[PDB]
Design a protein around this ligand. Sequence first.
Ligand SMILES: OC[C@H]1O[C@H](O[C@H]2[C@H](O)[C@@H](O)[C@@H](O[C@H]3[C@H](O)[C@@H](O)[C@@H](O)O[C@@H]3CO)O[C@@H]2CO)[C@H](O)[C@@H](O)[C@@H]1O
Length: 435
Amino acid sequence: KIEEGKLVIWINGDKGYNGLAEVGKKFEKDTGIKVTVEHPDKLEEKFPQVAATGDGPDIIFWAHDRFGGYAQSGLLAEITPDKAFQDKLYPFTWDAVRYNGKLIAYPIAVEALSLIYNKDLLPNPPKTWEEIPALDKELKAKGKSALMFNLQEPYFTWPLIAADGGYAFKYENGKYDIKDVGVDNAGAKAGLTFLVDLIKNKHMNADTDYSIAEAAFNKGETAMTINGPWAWSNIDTSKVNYGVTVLPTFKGQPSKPFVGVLSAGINAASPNKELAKEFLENYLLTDEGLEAVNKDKPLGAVALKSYEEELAKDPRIAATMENAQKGEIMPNIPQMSAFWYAVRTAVINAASGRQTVDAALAAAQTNAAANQASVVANQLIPINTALTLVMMRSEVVTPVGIPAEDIPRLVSMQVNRAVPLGTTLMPDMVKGYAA
Ligand SMILES: OC[C@H]1O[C@H](O[C@H]2[C@H](O)[C@@H](O)[C@@H](O[C@H]3[C@H](O)[C@@H](O)[C@@H](O)O[C@@H]3CO)O[C@@H]2CO)[C@H](O)[C@@H](O)[C@@H]1O
């Protein structure tokens, strides 16, 4: 699918890919180089799996946190901006995409979660997490809710987990100490406990995901959500009169969102490295280029100084940078995805009641040092067999499969194909796995 003299680009489905495609059509008009923008599911998992070979796209877009792992594995071309080009972008954004000395991607924009609120339900939004139970009660009476946001992705809960002292890897000297993990300290427990009580007290549902929370906010049913700049386009379109503001504090500490830098990497395997560079440097990272993407879905505070100077005038963007400042830039180290999986698991388990907070975070501290494991058949499993534990073991494999953490829930569910011993159990092999 990668061919000399064409570009294939991958970007996430929540970003402005139609806008990016317009930049691509301008590139093609100038250069004769066809550009195809795709937004695959699980692209960030898909990329390391397929570029491992020589496949995948010429250009990949993601937050910088995933980049060091791609670099560590040799999947990224070292990029070669000249000093004048580097000077067009904020130094702290190049920092985000520097790994083991080398620039491994182009920074595009600075993403931080903010509190989004409906001015016609809550004209004065809460300054603290602690007042939200009371607010939800008052609003429940009016047939509304106070707050909904995606609880299936740790990105969204981390600001609260971090507020009172949770952290990922301790930053010491000038290094991240990957032996000093902070997902199971007192502050982390306090934050996750506070969320678990929101659910226990019926102020939030453990099953709330991205699209549920978005539909509810945009339909005027809940007073508040937590989301990024990319979400503002759809709220605009729904004519909710909304504001963007600083996240609530918890125990008098600011929420500390993990800050991402949307970045564009060039595939080490691409025979279009120069074309990709000229697309990125001369078409995308221009006022016009970024405008076109931003108009589709807002980017946040862009890395390009000249266009940010304009965007910075928007209170929404100032709100984004205030939240950014209170939070922390994500590491880009390879251990970041293991960290995220460990915390994903902990949050989902604690919130659903499958595990206590303390137990869930103890497991997260241990798992942050490991890697996401998948279900592997421990026996020949004939077609239509109801799964028992002795049929399933756990292994760190690529491509990943059903999460090993799902084994208990798999018990009694049926496979729809014969699964040989040692085969990775995939989601499409199990009947009813969608639920
Ligand atoms: O939860 C499992 C998940 O963990 C890792 O995903 C994290 C991303 O790496 C990280 O950048 C961030 O993702 C957010 C984006 O930055 C933002 O642009 C927007 O698209 O929302 C994203 C959150 O949904 O946080 C997530 C974790 O929540 C890991 O790399 C993934 O492969 C893995 O599936």
